[PDB]
Structures are given as structure tokens and as C-alpha cells.
Design a protein around this nucleic acid. Structure first.
Ligand SMILES: [Zn+2]
Ligand SMILES: [Zn+2]
Ligand SMILES: [Zn+2]
Lengths: 99, 105, 332, 121, 81, 43, 161, 250, 237
RNA sequence: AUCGCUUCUCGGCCUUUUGGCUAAGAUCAAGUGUAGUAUCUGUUCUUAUCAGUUUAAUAUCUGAUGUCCUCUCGAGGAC
């Protein structure tokens, strides 16, 4: 997995190099590739991603969408503004709290 | 060997039988674990010299090929005066590596 | 400031002496130990003067000295027990005029320690083993042999370690080609260590004990013990085998006591006193040195008492058991 | 509550308090029945000012020997035996230095000079 | 517990093979008693403290030797209790 | 190696230093010092 | 036993302060309790030397002591408050003059003899700033016209440059 | 509790401080020792060395030394003389300018004999210019913060320094004796300080230090104190066997 | 390499080619290796500097070691300390010329820079004492005892047994008097951790040289019931 | 002198922030086992005596929380 220490070194690298030079950023870290550095930045570390709690507008959206386009989370996600992994876990969450 | 705290010496009374080294172990001291200025020869307990135990590495236990010595530092602090310095127990590391291998290949 | 140390007059006081055929001829010579100096003297039989053939600095304390002669051999080697951690066997080369080191066997650490052998050094009369012993807790026994080339070869040590036992004296009992035997005086401070009043401080008494090799089985067994009436300070071997009985004389304070194992009873004879002397009457009397003169005819022990009075001792014996002890004033 | 006041003007943690052993009250009587918190402060207190005074008032110098003594009767008694000690090891010529007169009998130098200038010796 | 009695083990071993050592629970009595006994065995080894003593009193070296070895069984009083 | 002159901690890597500054210890000590400085405000 | 180190030189450390106190007497504490931000000494300092007469002769000696060149004041812990003086003695010293006139006020100027550069002897004139104008009143009234060291004194509140 | 019986045995600190011959030695916890009379007697033996300060401290030892920053080790003078320092500085800066390419290139094509240092200067530095440092006498254990103690017990006014005289406006160097500190004027004026009856002033209570001049211009030693008869006020302001080592190399 | 034969032989040949060429260049490329990170290579370069110094005399390579101890890394400072440990054990009796050059480095390291700094300066002191035994270089060793001794209350296995080794080297080179003057006050301490350590040290002074101590023990008075004073040693004659 | 303007000049230290193109020009970063320590991150202790355990001492841990009625650890009272 990723540790606070890698994460902060990534944040600093990206903030110096920019978001298209993943190969030198991957050279800066040990046990990390450019594929993985990129995935981490665009999944969790990007300050555009929001980690708050769901407005119930957002949750009525999530439910309506996840019924209209079933199993299509990378397509659902941008229509509501969080990553596909967050949408998906929180959706299962509402489902089991409702079950 | 000053490196592995888990091992133990025969510690019983000396003899006249010189001590012998395996080729892995060749050249070092038996307590100080040095590599230099060897001064006096090793003498081993008769029990730990009896039978199959003749002509082996004091340390390794394999086929002895050369005579074991004591460094000048052991000789000056008189750590050569304690009787048979044969390690009488195998340790964790021998069987440990052996099992890791025998699982590997 | 750097100094350099030279000696001008070697030491001249004598601590131990042994006598034997250290040259190989039929001449008898004396090896004395000055403090840390070993020297070999020879008394000339004609003039009556003593010549000092040789003097060596041994750079150690000499704590004991024995001469010993292999069985069937014609020389005497010198076993030496010092404050080092070894026992050393020396043989004199009369041609080059020097002692040469036959053997040297290590068993412990250096210095006048308390559980490290070196203080007492007994030998066995037929010449098959030596025993070296500390003042407490340790005794080793070395075995001695000839090889093919009839050179001295020495075994590994046996052991007799026993805890909480002082040792007052050790000597080799004379037996003919049985298992060698050694006769330790002893004591056991183990209880006076644990007696909050002082009871066991008194009424703890020595026990003479015989240790016995087992050359067939190669270990040393503590064969006999038995307490002694009062505290005695040393032990004289009684020439055994064919000649004489065997056993030990024990020289305790105001007494001298033959003693042997088997059914042999014990014997005692007070030490004679000087008629009408002025010494504070409580002080006791002991023997300080002794010497066995034994020729093909008889044997007799010269003993000396604190005042310097020599006495001659003989043992009137039936075939086996000695029946009486016969002291006779000799000189002072 | 009454926690110690921290370097940030705040009360320090209860566990830090427990560790430093501040709850423990040490009475310095010589200090006017003062009370200290913490063995650290208590030990410093013997060179701290208020004890310096207390001992000045007592008439016994705040020296090493009386540190960790708190009861005044004890300080006094100890000061007495210490007076005796230093008195022993000191050298008073007046009392020992023994002087023989011209009449060959001994006085100490005190009486020697006394009856010396007193017209006689 | 663990460390307590395991070093109690190692020290029992040390002592029992070496009379005279100590541990955290060694009393004044046994300290000074081993210290006396060693002193005696060394007056006897050293050929010249034996002279010094035999000359300082007026005995012979054999009697002095005998006296030391007599004292060596309770040199400092009876045990603590 | 590195030290935080404020929280008085030691760090093996610079990654460790940065992770420090983003942590409870560093933040609360920083808040205390901000407060303390506010206290320190004045012909 | 307490002494005020005023004019304590900006960099003259507790080492110099207590090394001077020790060279004079039983220096048991010197302290510059200072500006809790800039760290530099407070221009006021508290030094305890156990003996009262030690502190006394210490203050007597440490007047005009030139720590970092500037006279450091050691004592008990500029509106124009100066007296000019005529008919001064050329045998006078400034430390001795501060010791003499200072009882009406401490020396907020070291007593400067208005003497030429050509020869170096006094012209009978001097000037020194006391503590207060009331101090100038007292000093110059108890020293006005009276018999000074060699020439009867004549001192009045300062004529300024 | 038998523990509390052992506690009933535990003297009070004043009990101890009373019985023992030296009470200073007794510390607080000394009471808690299973042998307090022994313990104090052993603390009062000559030449022995007291336990290290930090056995009670809750922080470990130089783990507490932690906070501040430290200057790099400082080479001995006899090793500075040989100039190895600037040599290795030059190479460090060159190699920090180097990049990975040139590093491998010199790994494969070395610049042999680029720079050198001569022997006989190393040999003089070790066998002919060595010196004994200042060592510590028996029993001066080290503790955290020992090296940030200026010094103390230096009761002597004669001991002057360089920073001292500099920020006094007085000279250091060979003319230190002929250099009077600001204290000698009021010393001659009102005696030495009255804790130091036994201090002698250079130029005021003692003779002029050699080649120094009594006088009142810049750089002199004043008008020496004497009475109205001609007797000096303190000391003498005007200055009224076979110690060979025994066995020593020529 | 994973095999110890190869590394031993490699270190030896660093020695040989230092004998062919001068020492300087091989020694410079060897201080650079102390800049790596895996320990086995750095411990093997530490033995290679010792060998270079012992073949071509130590006065050639010491100034460069002592200077390399001034660069700000952990691993190179421990590299030069471990290198001195090996070097003093190798040169043996010729330590007596460099002991004074070295000591100001060791006291500097024994005032912490790390646990491992103190552990490795303690090993240096052990081998340096065993080498300079008998030549009167004893005030240096006592001065270093003052710095090694406070590390007696440690708990890391390796730091505590490095300090023990140092104290027994210094026992043979400083003698048992000094060591007993250091052990005395803590044998009967109030605490018990300090009694544990002090009795371990005292046992190791006792076991070796238990006879030299007869002359050294302190005078302990006799109480009411037993007699603790040795009077034979006060007979005058 | 002031206001408006024009032009020139001096200044701050500011401001400004980089070699064009192409198939982002192309490609790509190989350790481990055994014992042990340290450092960060994270997490956590108002409660009251008193007894005991333990400790160098804290702590820890274990334990109940003057007598009587009642109102609600609290309250009045005869004691
Ligand atoms: Zn082998
Ligand atoms: Zn060895
Ligand atoms: Zn064996």
C-alpha cells in the first residue's frame, strides 16, 4: 500500500514537476512505478478530489444513476463528482444500511 | 564466536588433543572471532574429542583440516584457560536456513 | 624517566628443596627453590662443600616442588607447581647445564588463586601419577607413562573437584602396583558458613580421606574418609609395598599418629617435651618439617619440632599391622 | 483541577503530571512550614532562597551537610555534632601547645604569655 | 519474573563455578568473608608475605601457615543472623 | 538527518519530516505558538 | 549583597561580568535577566556577591569599568542635568571625582576635565552630568566655593555646547 | 508487612546523617539501601568514583542531549599543518560538480596521479610534531552538558583573558602584565575589594610588572599608594634546593 | 557477494594493489564507498581501509580518515570509527604512536552522536587498550574511561556488550585498582538496576585478576559482633 | 510658486521566467534470510481517601467506599 511518507513525497514531486512527467516522479520513489504514481495521484491525492460526507442531494443522485446505468462506475462517477471507488463503496453502504 | 548469543561451550576440562577447523571456518579465532595474530593452539575436552567427534571443526562440526588458534587478545586476557570451547548446540540458523532451502528447492 | 633493573645479589633464602639423581648418575643432588629462583646444588662427597651448579630466574612464584622418577627409570624429573596456570615437568641436561622443559600443561588462570591448583603437589611413589591441588575445591590428577622411545608422555587430567572443602596437605600413599592412592587432609567450612551462633565453628573437625585412581576405568574415586580426633597439619608417607607397612603418619598438635585403612587400628604418642623449659605453658607444639631415610635395611623418619629438636621415628611392626611408634630424641 | 501551568500558559497533561510526581507534598519546616510539589523542586529547595533564610535565622549555614534535613531540632543537633567534629580536627595552639617554664614544669602558651608579661615568666 | 530469575540463573552458575562473585543480593558478610579467605590463600601462596608475617610475630612459617589455615573457616565472626 | 526545532523530534528521511509537519503533534504545537505570539502582541 | 550592573555592555557576557566579580570577591551569582526576545542583556543586571563590604568595594572599583569600551556601572540593586565646574585641581582624577561628588547623585557622566590637547594639564575647568537637577542643586550647593582638592571649588549647573 | 518491618528499619535521613562520620555524602535515597552504613562508608572512601547522575532521570542519556546543532569535529593542530584538509575539500567540490556520466567515465578511464601529498610531512606530523592533549584526571565522569560549563573556582584576579581585556579596552598578549585592567585605578583609590584582602594588584598593590611604568598618562601605573610616612598601603607597590629532575634523558 | 571467501579475498587484494601503487588513490576510492547504504559492503570497505593502513604505514592514511570524520553523514562517521577499531587490532603494539592523535576523536564520538557512535568508539577503546598494554600510555586510557563509563546504564544488547568489552580491555591495561575505584560506590546502591550492572562488572574484574585485588580492597570497619579488619596487613616490621 | 501637458533624464527593486521541431523524440529502473535497537505516525490516563502489592521513589496493580434515622454522592440532626 501507500504510506504517509510516500504520499507526501509524491505531493511534493508533483507540485514541482507537474502532472505529465510521471517517469521522473517514479524515479524519485523506491518500489513505485509511474503507473502507480499516476493512479495514486488521480485516485486520492489530487486536491480536486473531495473527501467530505454526502449531501443527500448527492445520495439521491447516486441512487438514481446507479439504477439507470448499472455497474458502470467510471461513467457514473464524474456525473456526481467523486471517484468511482468512493461512489461504489458509499453505494453499497446505503444499500446495506437500507437492508 | 562473539556473534551469536544463542550458543554454548562444552566448558569442561582441557586435554592434549589439538583442535581442528573446517574450511569455511578456517583461520578465525574461536572466541574473539578475529582473523589475526593467532598465538596459541586449541585443546579440547576428551569427551568432546571421543569417537566420531575426532578431527572436526570445533565451530562448524565438519571435517577438520587445520589447527585452531587463539588470538593474542584472548591470550592476554586469558580466555584460553576455560577448557573445551566446542559449541555443543546447533543453533537456530543452521536448521532455519536448511528448512528455507528444502522448501525452496 | 626510564629505569633499568639489575640484580646484584640473587636471593639467598630457601623455601623448598628436593633431592635426587637429577643428573642420571649415582650422584644425589639438591634442587632448592629460592623465592622465584630455581637452583641446583651438589654436595661433594669428599670435601663436604656444596657447589651451586646452576641458577635460573623463573619469573613466577614457585608454590611447590616435587621430584619424581618413572618406574624402571634412572633419572628424576622435577615437577613444579607455580602461581601460573600450568604444571611443568623439567629435566636437567648435565651436559649443557640447563633445565629443559619436558612438559607444560595448562589448567586455569594465573596468580595465587584459591580454587586453582598449584599449592599442593603430591606424587605417587611408584611413579605413575601426579596430583596437583588447590587450597579449596580443585584437584587434578595427571597420569605418566613411557612411550616406545621411553620418553615421558603425559595424559589428560582427571578430576576430583569437591565443593566447600579446604585442604591442609596431600601426599601419595605407597601401594605396590595397585591403583595409586592419595591421602588428603581436609575440612568442610560449609556448615560454619550457615551456623548463626558459632556452634559449628568449633566442633568441625578434619577428616583424612583417601582418593584412589582407577587406571582400568580412568577416573578418580573417593574411596575412604574418616574424622580425626584433633586438627593436624601434615602427613608423612610410610614406605609401602614389600618394604614396611604402608599408610600415613599424621602430625597433629602435641601428637603424632600412625593411621592406615583396613582393620589397622589407630596409634598415638604424645610429642616429648623439654624438661623444665620456660615457655608460656598454654602454647602447644607441632612438627614443622620431616624427612624419610629408608635404606635396604630399615627406614626411619626424622621429624623436627618448633624449637628445632629433631626426633627419630621407627615403627615396630608385625608382618602387616604396626603395633607401636617409637620416638627418640636425635639432636637440635 | 489545579494542574501545573505549562510553558504555553496551559495545564500540562494529567499523565505527564502523574509521571513528574507533582501531587506529592514535601514539607519544609525551616521554610516556615512551606510545602513543595515534586521531588525535583523539593531537592532544589535547599539551595532555593526561602530555605537559605530559614537556616540563616536558625544560625546554621546552608551548607551541603544539612541538605535533606528538614526538622529544626535535627538541624540543630547535627550542627552541634559537626561543631564538635570541626573543633576536633582544627588546631588550637592556645590549648595544646605545651610550654615548660624555667622551673621546668609545663603550661600551655596561653598561661605562658599570661604570667610572662604578668611580671613573672 | 523472566529476566529476574534468568539472570539469577546465570549468576548462580557463575558463583557456583567461581566462589567469590556476587549479585544484587549480596550481603556485607559474605562479601567481606570471601575477601578474607582470598587474602589468606594468597598470604600462603606468596613466599614473602609469609616471611613478613613470621618475622612480625615471632613464629615459624609452618606454624603461621597452620594458623592461617585454621582461621580460614570463620574469619569474620559467625554468620549474619 | 532532520529535526523539528519546534516539536523537538528527529527524522530519518525527509518524507518523515513532511509527514511530521502534517500531524497532530506539529499542528497543535504550531497553534500554541501562534497563540503565544498573539499574547506577545503589543514646537 | 546585591549589585546593579547598569550600562552593562551589550555583548559583555555573564562570563565577563562574573569573572570580574570573582576577581574582586566571592562571586556567588551574576545574572543578566534580559529582553525575553532579543536575548541581549537588559542594560540592567542583578549580581549577588555574598559579602557586603565585597559588594561595597566592588561598586567602588567598578565605576567607569569599560565593558566593551563603554563604562559599565556597578552599584546597589539627559534633560541637561549636568554641572560644570571652575577652579578645579589638575591633580584630580575622574574616578576619584565621581567618588567625591557622587554622594549627591550617581555619575551619569564621567567627570571630564576641560584640559587642552597641547600639554595635557587641566585648565581649572570640568563638567559632569549628575542624576537629577535636584542632584545638581545639592552637589553644587555643597561644593560651591568650598575648598576642593587644591583650588577651592566653583561648580554650577551646566553650560551646554 | 515484613516489607514494612524492613521499612521500620529504615532510618530517617537525619538518623543517618547523625551516625555516619561524613554526612555530606549521604543523599536522599541512601536510607533505602539494604546496607546504609556500608553504603555511606563506601561513598566516603578516598579516590572512589560516584555513580553517574542519570540513573534516576526518566529520559535516557544523550537522547536528552538531542536538541541543538553542533559544529563538525575539529582536527588537531599537528594534523592541520600538513594541509590534508584543503586537499580533500578540493576533491569534494570537484566531485559534487561531477554528473553521473562523468563519474562512470572516470570509473572507466581514471585520472591517475591527478594530485598527491608528500610523505615525510605525514612522518613529521606523527613522529615529530605530536603533542599531548589536555586529559582528564581520575574520576571526572562526563554527563550531558559538561562541555557547556565555562569554568569555576577561579577566585584569582591575576587570571586575565583575551576577550575580557579586549572588551575592557585593555591589551592581551605578552604585554598583559604591563596592561592594567579598569579595576586597578579604584584599587589604588580605595583598596582591593573587601572580599579580597588577599588579592594583590598589578601596579597598585604589587611592584610594576616588568617593563611597566608607574604613571598617569595613557598606559601607566599611577602614583603608588603609600602612607604619610612612606609605607605602602597594600603589599609593596614598588617591589622592595637543587630542583633538578633526577633520572632524565640528556 | 553472498560468499565470505570472495569478500575476504577482495579485501586482501585491495591491500596488495595498495602495496604496488601508493596508498592515496585506493584509499580515496575507499572513503567514497563508505558513502553507500547497504551495510555488508560498508563493513567490508571498513576492513579494507584497515588493511591498507597496516601494509603501508598508518601515518599515511590516518589524516585522511580523521578528516573524513568531519563530513556530515552517519554512515561515514561510523565507517571511520569501525575502521579504527580494525586498524588498532591489526597494528597491535605500534598503537602507542597514534593513541594521542586518536583520542580527541573518540571522546568526541563518545559524547553522543548516536547509539552506534558510542558502541563503535567503545570497540575502538577495547582494542586500543589491549594493544598498548605495557607501554605506559595510561593517562590517555584513563581519560577515555571517564567517557566510556557513563554508558554503563544501557539496555541495547550491542551497546552494552561493546561497553563491557571496553571495560575489560581497560582492566588489563589500566589495572584492577582503577576499575575497583570505579565499581565501589555502586555495589550496595539503593536501587537495583545499578546494583545489577555494578555486580556484573565487578564479577568480571574479579574472575580475571582476583589475586591482584587482595592488595586493593578498601578498609571496612568492624561492627559490634564481627571483625572485618585485616590486621596482618598492619603488622609493622 | 501652483495646475495642465509634452519630451528627456536619474532611481527603487519590481518585474520576467527562457533551445525551435518530431513517433509525450524513444526506451527503462530484479534481492533475500537470522537476531536486535532506534525514530516517526497513530492511541490513550481528574478520583475520593485507605489498605495491600510492588518500586530506589513514584508509579503500577489489587482491593471497600466515626456510627444511627430519614429528605433527595449530596442534606438536617441527638451524638
Ligand atoms: Zn568449519
Ligand atoms: Zn579470540
Ligand atoms: Zn568438550
Amino acid at each position: 500500500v501507500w504510506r504517509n511518507t510516500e504520499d507526501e513525497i509524491l505531493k511534493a514531486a508533483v507540485m514541482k514537476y507537474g502532472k505529465n512527467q510521471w517517469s521522473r516522479i517514479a524515479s524519485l520513489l523506491h518500489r513505485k512505478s509511474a503507473k502507480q504514481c499516476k493512479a495514486r495521484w488521480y485516485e486520492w491525492l489530487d486536491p480536486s478530489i473531495k473527501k467530505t460526507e454526502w449531501s443527500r442531494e448527492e445520495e439521491e443522485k447516486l441512487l438514481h444513476l446507479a439504477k439507470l446505468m448499472p455497474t458502470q462506475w467510471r461513467t457514473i462517477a464524474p456525473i456526481i463528482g467523486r471517484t468511482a471507488a468512493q461512489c461504489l463503496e458509499h453505494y453499497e453502504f446505503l444499500l446495506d444500511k437500507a437492508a | 564466536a562473539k556473534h551469536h548469543p544463542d550458543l554454548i561451550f562444552c566448558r569442561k576440562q582441557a586435554g592434549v588433543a589439538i583442535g581442528r577447523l573446517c574450511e569455511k571456518c578456517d583461520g578465525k579465532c574461536v572466541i574473539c572471532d578475529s582473523y589475526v595474530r593467532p598465538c596459541t593452539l586449541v585443546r579440547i575436552c576428551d569427551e568432546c574429542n571421543y569417537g566420531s567427534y575426532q578431527g572436526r571443526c570445533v565451530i562448524c562440526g565438519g571435517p577438520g583440516v587445520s589447527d585452531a588458534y587463539y588470538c593474542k587478545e584472548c591470550t592476554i586476557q586469558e580466555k584460553d584457560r576455560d577448557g573445551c570451547p566446542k559449541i555443543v548446540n546447533l543453533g537456530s540458523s543452521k536448521t532455519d536456513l536448511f528448512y528455507e532451502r528444502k522448501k525452496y528447492g | 624517566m626510564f629505569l633499568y633493573n639489575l640484580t646484584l645479589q640473587r636471593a639467598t633464602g630457601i623455601s623448598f628443596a628436593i633431592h635426587g639423581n637429577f643428573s642420571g648418575t649415582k650422584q644425589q643432588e639438591i634442587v632448592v627453590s629460592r623465592g622465584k629462583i630455581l637452583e641446583l646444588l651438589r654436595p661433594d662427597p669428599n670435601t663436604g662443600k656444596v657447589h651451586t651448579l646452576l641458577t635460573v630466574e623463573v619469573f613466577g612464584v614457585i608454590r611447590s616442588l616435587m621430584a619424581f622418577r618413572l618406574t624402571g627409570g634412572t633419572k628424576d624429573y622435577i615437577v613444579v607447581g607455580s602461581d601460573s596456570g600450568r604444571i611443568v615437568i623439567l629435566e636437567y641436561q648435565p651436559s649443557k647445564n640447563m633445565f629443559e622443559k619436558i612438559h607444560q600443561e595448562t589448567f586455569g588462570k594465573s596468580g595465587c588463586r584459591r580454587i586453582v591448583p598449584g599449592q599442593f603437589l603430591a606424587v605417587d611413589p611408584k611413579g605413575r601419577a601426579v596430583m596437583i591441588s588447590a587450597i579449596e575445591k580443585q584437584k587434578l590428577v595427571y597420569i605418566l607413562n613411557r612411550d616406545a622411545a621411553a620418553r615421558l608422555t603425559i595424559s589428560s587430567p582427571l578430576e576430583a573437584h569437591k565443593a566447600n572443602t579446604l585442604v591442609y596437605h596431600v601426599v601419595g600413599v605407597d601401594v605396590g602396583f595397585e591403583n595409586p592412592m592419595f591421602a588428603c587432609l581436609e575440612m568442610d567450612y560449609e556448615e560454619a558458613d550457615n551456623d548463626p551462633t558459632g556452634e559449628a565453628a568449633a566442633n568441625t573437625q578434619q577428616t583424612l580421606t583417601f582418593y584412589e585412581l582407577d587406571l582400568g576405568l580412568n577416573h578418580v574415586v573417593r574411596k575412604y574418609s574418616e574424622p580425626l580426633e584433633e586438627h593436624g597439619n601434615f602427613l608423612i608417607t610410610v614406605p609401602g609395598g614389600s618394604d614396611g607397612p604402608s599408610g600415613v603418619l599424621i602430625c597433629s598438635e602435641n601428637y603424632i599418629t600412625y593411621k592406615n585403612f583396613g582393620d589397622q587400628p589407630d596409634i598415638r604418642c604424645p610429642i616429648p617435651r623439654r624438661r623444665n623449659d620456660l615457655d608460656d605453658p598454654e602454647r602447644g607444639m607441632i612438627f614443622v618439617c620431616s624427612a624419610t631415610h629408608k635404606t635396604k635395611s630399615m627406614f626411619f623418619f626424622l621429624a623436627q619440632t618448633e624449637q628445632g629438636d629433631i626426633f627419630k621415628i621407627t615403627l615396630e611392626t608385625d608382618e602387616d599391622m604396626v603395633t607401636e611408634i617409637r620416638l627418640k630424641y636425635f639432636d637440635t | 483541577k489545579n494542574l501545573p501551568l505549562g510553558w504555553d500558559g496551559k495545564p500540562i497533561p494529567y499523565w505527564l503530571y502523574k509521571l513528574h510526581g507533582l501531587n506529592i507534598n514535601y514539607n519544609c519546616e525551616i521554610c516556615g512550614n512551606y510545602t513543595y510539589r515534586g521531588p525535583k523542586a523539593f531537592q532544589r529547595h535547599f539551595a532555593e532562597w526561602r530555605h537559605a533564610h530559614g537556616m540563616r535565622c536558625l544560625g546554621i549555614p546552608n551548607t551541603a551537610h544539612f541538605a535533606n534535613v528538614t526538622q529544626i531540632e535535627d538541624a540543630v543537633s547535627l550542627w552541634a555534632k559537626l561543631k564538635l567534629q570541626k573543633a576536633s580536627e582544627r588546631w588550637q595552639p592556645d590549648t595544646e601547645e605545651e610550654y615548660e617554664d624555667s622551673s621546668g614544669n609545663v603550661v600551655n602558651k596561653k598561661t605562658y604569655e599570661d604570667l610572662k608579661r604578668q611580671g613573672l615568666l | 519474573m523472566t529476566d529476574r530469575y534468568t539472570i539469577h540463573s546465570q549468576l548462580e552458575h557463575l558463583q557456583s563455578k567461581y566462589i567469590g562473585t556476587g549479585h544484587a543480593d549480596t550481603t556485607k558478610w559474605e562479601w567481606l568473608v570471601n575477601q578474607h579467605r582470598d587474602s589468606y590463600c594468597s598470604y600462603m601462596g606468596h613466599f614473602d608475605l609469609l616471611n613478613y608475617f613470621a618475622i612480625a610475630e615471632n613464629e615459624s612459617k609452618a606454624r603461621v601457615r597452620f594458623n592461617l589455615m585454621e582461621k580460614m573457616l570463620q574469619p569474620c565472626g559467625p554468620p549474619a543472623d | 538527518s532532520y529535526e523539528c526545532k519546534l516539536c523537538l523530534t528527529l527524522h530519518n528521511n525527509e518524507g518523515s519530516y513532511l509527514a511530521h509537519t502534517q500531524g497532530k503533534k506539529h499542528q497543535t504545537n504550531l497553534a500554541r505558538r501562534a497563540a503565544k505570539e498573539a499574547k506577545e502582541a503589543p514646537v | 549583597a546585591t549589585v546593579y550592573v547598569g550600562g552593562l555592555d551589550e555583548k559583555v557576557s555573564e562570563p565577563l561580568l562574573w569573572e570580574l566579580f570573582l576577581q574582586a570577591g566571592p562571586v556567588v551569582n551574576t545574572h543578566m535577566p534580559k529582553d525575553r526576545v532579543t536575548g541581549q542583556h537588559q542594560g540592567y543586571g542583578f549580581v549577588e556577591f555574598l559579602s557586603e563590604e565585597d559588594a561595597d568595594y566592588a561598586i567602588k572599583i567598578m565605576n567607569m569599568i569599560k565593558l566593551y569600551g563603554k563604562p559599565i556601572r556597578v552599584n546597589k540593586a539627559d534633560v541637561g542635568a549636568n554641572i560644570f565646574i571652575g577652579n578645579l585641581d589638575p591633580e584630580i582624577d575622574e574616578k576619584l571625582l565621581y567618588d567625591t561628588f557622587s554622594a549627591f547623585g550617581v555619575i551619569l557622566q564621567t567627570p571630564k576635565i576641560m584640559r587642552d590637547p597641547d600639554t595635557g594639564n587641566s585648565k581649572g575647568y570640568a563638567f559632569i552630568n549628575f542624576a537629577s537637577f535636584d542632584a545638581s542643586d545639592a552637589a553644587i550647593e555643597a561644593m560651591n566655593g568650598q575648598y576642593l582638592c587644591n583650588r577651592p571649588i566653583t561648580v554650577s549647573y551646566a553650560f551646554k555646547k | 508487612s515484613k516489607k514494612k518491618l524492613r521499612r521500620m528499619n529504615r532510618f530517617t535521613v537525619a538518623e543517618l546523617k547523625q551516625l555516619v562520620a561524613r554526612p555530606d555524602v549521604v543523599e536522599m535515597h541512601d536510607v533505602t539501601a539494604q546496607d546504609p552504613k556500608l553504603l555511606v562508608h563506601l561513598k566516603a572512601t578516598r579516590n572512589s568514583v560516584p555513580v553517574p547522575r542519570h540513573w534516576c532521570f526518566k529520559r535516557k542519556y544523550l537522547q536528552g542531549k538531542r536538541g541543538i546543532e553542533k559544529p563538525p569535529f575539529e582536527l588537531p593542530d599537528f594534523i592541520k599543518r600538513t594541509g590534508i584538509q584543503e586537499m580533500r575539500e578540493a576533491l569534494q567540490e570537484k566531485e559534487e560538480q561531477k554528473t553521473m556520466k562523468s563519474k562512470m567515465r572516470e570509473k572507466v578511464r581514471p585520472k591517475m596521479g591527478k594530485i598527491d601529498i608528500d610523505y615525510q610531512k605525514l612522518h613529521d606530523a606523527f613522529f615529530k610534531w605530536q603533542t599531548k592533549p589536555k586529559l582528564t584526571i581520575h574520576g571526572d565522569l562526563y554527563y550531558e552538558g559538561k562541555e557547556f560549563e565555562t569554568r569555576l573556582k577561579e577566585k584569582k584576579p591575576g587570571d586575565l583573558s583575551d576577550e575580557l581585556r579586549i572588551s575592557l579596552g585593555m591589551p592581551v598578549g605578552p604585554n598583559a602584565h604591563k596592561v592594567p585592567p579598569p579595576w586597578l585605578i579604584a584599587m589604588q583609590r580605595y583598596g582591593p575589594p573587601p572580599s579580597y584582602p588577599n588579592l594583590k594588584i598589578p601596579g597598585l598593590n604589587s611592584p610594576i610588572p616588568e617593563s611597566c611604568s608607574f604613571g598617569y598618562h595613557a598606559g601607566g601605573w599611577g602614583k603608588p599608594p603609600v602612607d604619610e610616612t612612606g609605607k605602602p598601603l597594600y603589599g609593596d607597590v614598588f617591589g622592595t634546593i637543587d630542583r633538578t629532575p633526577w633520572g632524565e634523558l640528556e | 557477494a553472498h560468499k565470505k571467501a570472495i569478500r575476504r579475498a577482495t579485501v586482501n587484494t585491495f591491500g596488495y594493489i595498495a602495496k604496488a601503487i601508493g596508498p592515496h588513490d585506493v584509499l580515496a576510492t575507499l572513503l567514497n564507498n563508505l558513502k553507500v547504504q547497504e551495510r555488508q559492503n560498508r563493513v567490508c570497505t571498513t576492513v579494507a581501509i584497515a588493511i591498507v593502513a597496516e601494509t603501508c604505514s598508518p601515518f599515511t592514511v590516518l589524516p585522511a580518515l580523521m578528516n573524513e570524520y568531519r563530513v556530515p553523514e552517519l554512515n561515514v562517521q561510523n565507517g571511520v570509527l569501525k575502521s579504527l577499531s580494525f586498524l588498532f587490532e591489526y597494528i597491535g603494539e605500534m598503537g602507542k604512536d597514534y593513541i594521542y592523535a586518536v583520542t580527541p576523536l573518540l571522546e568526541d564520538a563518545l559524547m553522543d552522536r548516536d547509539l552506534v557512535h558510542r558502541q563503535t568508539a567503545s570497540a575502538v577503546v577495547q582494542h586500543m587498550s589491549l594493544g598498548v598494554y605495557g607501554f605506559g600510555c595510561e593517562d590517555s586510557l584513563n581519560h577515555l574511561l571517564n567517557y566510556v563509563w557513563p554508558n554503563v546504564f544501557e539496555t541495547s544488547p550491542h551497546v552494552i556488550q561493546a561497553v563491557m568489552g571496553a571495560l575489560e580491555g581497560l582492566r588489563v591495561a589500566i589495572g584492577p585498582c582503577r576499575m575497583l575505584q570505579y565499581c565501589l560506590q555502586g555495589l550496595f546502591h539503593p536501587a537495583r538496576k545499578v546494583r545489577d550492572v555494578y555486580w556484573k562488572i565487578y564479577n568480571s574484574i574479579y574472575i580475571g585478576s582476583q589475586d591482584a585485588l587482595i592488595a586493593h580492597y578498601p578498609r571496612i570497619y568492624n561492627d559490634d559482633k564481627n571483625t572485618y579488619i585485616r590486621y596482618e596487613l598492619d603488622y609493622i616490621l
